[PDB]
């Protein structure tokens, strides 16, 4: 696992908001899973 700082590359003075993360899902992901779906989330599985 390798990582480095990119403050002078990716970050911007106005805020670089071109990167996203997931925080809501009906259960956790499996190892090495690319869940890249993007629909409205509902706390009890309903359409919204």
């Amino acid at each position: 696992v390798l990582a480095w700082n990119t403050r002078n590359i990716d970050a911007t003075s106005t805020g670089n908001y071109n990167y996203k993360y997931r925080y809501l899902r009906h259960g956790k992901l499996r190892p090495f899973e690319r869940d890249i779906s993007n629909v409205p989330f509902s706390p009890d599985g309903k359409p919204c």
Binding site: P31, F32, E33, R34, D35
Partner: protein, 87 residues
């Protein structure tokens, strides 16, 4: 004339595929016997599989058939012959 066999498993982001076949003379049933399949693919797809569909051929018209079963975490003993073939 021929029976084709495949095994599909989705594990650690990889789709595993095994293949094998034999000559047949059956019309409607599923021939009994013993045959060991070999690995052919290991695809780093990283995708979520819960369903699948078969892709058929259109004619304009003989009959054809296929079969689906399900796999389980089951313990097996395998008998290897002198040449390393499972019999």
């Amino acid at each position: 004339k021929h029976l084709r066999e495949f095994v599909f498993k989705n594990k650690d982001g990889f789709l595993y595929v095994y293949k094998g076949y034999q000559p047949i003379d059956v019309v409607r049933d599923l021939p009994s016997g013993f045959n060991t399949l070999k690995p052919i693919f290991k695809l780093p797809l990283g995708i979520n599989i819960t369903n699948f569909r078969a892709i058929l051929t259109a004619f304009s018209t003989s009959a054809a058939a296929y079969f689906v079963g399900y796999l389980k975490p089951t313990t097996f003993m395998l008998k290897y012959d002198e040449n390393g073939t499972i019999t």
